[PDB]
């Protein structure tokens, strides 16, 4: 799966003209209401969560992944919705997406990536992930919301993989 295309990794909220293409990509794989899918991508911001797009100049949305911060783990990020466009799979773009996530997250001081999966566990072990224990991701909140916020006892009664990787 040697990869030959020139690719960049850019947040959706900096290329809003590509948000609709990114919704197409994700809904093709995991269909749900486009209203909801467009709103989720519209949450992307530098504060996290943010949606990264793997882009090709000649522009095509090759892939996407969502990064979210983790409750009580400042150096962790939760990776979700990892998908490469269906027609472009098997060309190395999935590896480069996950590797680009590591570079992006590490440049910002994060040291640990977390994600769930069932059917693609071997894809993640192949890229260096191993089994971990669960984490809770921090959802989007708008900047504008406040943010201040003796008888004997009777008898008693009687799946996904969590992957992590240090970066």
């Amino acid at each position: 799966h040697m990869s030959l295309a020139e690719l960049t990794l850019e947040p959706v909220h900096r290329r809003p003209e590509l948000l609709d293409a990114c919704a197409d990509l994700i809904n093709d794989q995991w269909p749900r209401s486009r209203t909801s899918r467009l709103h989720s991508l519209g949450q992307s911001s530098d504060a996290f969560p943010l949606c990264l797009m793997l882009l090709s100049p000649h522009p095509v949305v090759v892939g996407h992944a969502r990064l979210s911060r983790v409750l009580n783990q400042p150096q962790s990020l939760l990776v979700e919705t990892v998908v490469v466009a269906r027609a472009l799979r098997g060309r190395g773009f999935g590896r480069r997406l996950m590797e680009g996530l590591e570079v992006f997250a590490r440049a910002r001081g994060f040291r640990k990536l977390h994600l769930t999966t069932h059917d693609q566990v071997h894809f993640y072990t192949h890229l260096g992930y191993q089994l971990g224990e669960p984490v809770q991701g921090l959802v989007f909140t708008s900047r504008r919301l406040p943010a201040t916020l003796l008888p004997p006892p009777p008898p008693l009664p009687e799946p996904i993989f969590w992957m992590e990787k240090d970066i």
């Binding site: 009777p154 008693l156 009664p157």
Partner: protein, 138 residues
């Protein structure tokens, strides 16, 4: 023994305190988490919980093992409900916690959540243990 019930109620880590208290005849703590609050409940505190005056503790509050609490909901003497919801009171900004008391045929079941645990989780947990004990005629 009854301590197995404290173990059971404490297993999932949501609560910091739990106890089973007999309220008939002379009340006494049948089982409780050692070194916490409920283990120190007095007969007088039991008497207020199950008593006829269901109005004074709204303005005066009540205590459980000496910890002052505020009454949120009181259904402790109502059939089908048999639960009371409270929140502890603190001084100097120290955190407060949600409490639920349920009333069976012979016991009061008390649960105190850890910090941040929602009272609905505590209420449901206490209600299910009480239902299990009523079904056993306890």
């Amino acid at each position: 023994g009854w301590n197995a019930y404290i173990d059971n109620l404490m297993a999932d880590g949501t609560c910091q305190d739990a106890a089973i208290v007999g309220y008939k005849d002379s009340p006494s703590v049948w089982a409780a988490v050692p070194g916490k609050t409920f283990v120190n409940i007095t007969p007088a505190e039991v008497g207020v919980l199950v008593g006829k005056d269901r109005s004074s503790f709204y303005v005066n509050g009540l205590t459980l093992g000496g910890q002052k609490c505020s009454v949120i909901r009181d259904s402790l003497l109502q059939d089908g409900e048999f639960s009371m919801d409270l929140r502890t009171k603190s001084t100097g900004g120290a955190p407060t916690f949600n409490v639920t008391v349920t009333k069976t045929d012979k016991t009061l079941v008390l649960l105190m959540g850890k910090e941040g645990v929602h009272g609905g989780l505590i209420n449901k947990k206490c209600y299910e243990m009480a239902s299990h004990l009523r079904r056993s005629q306890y």
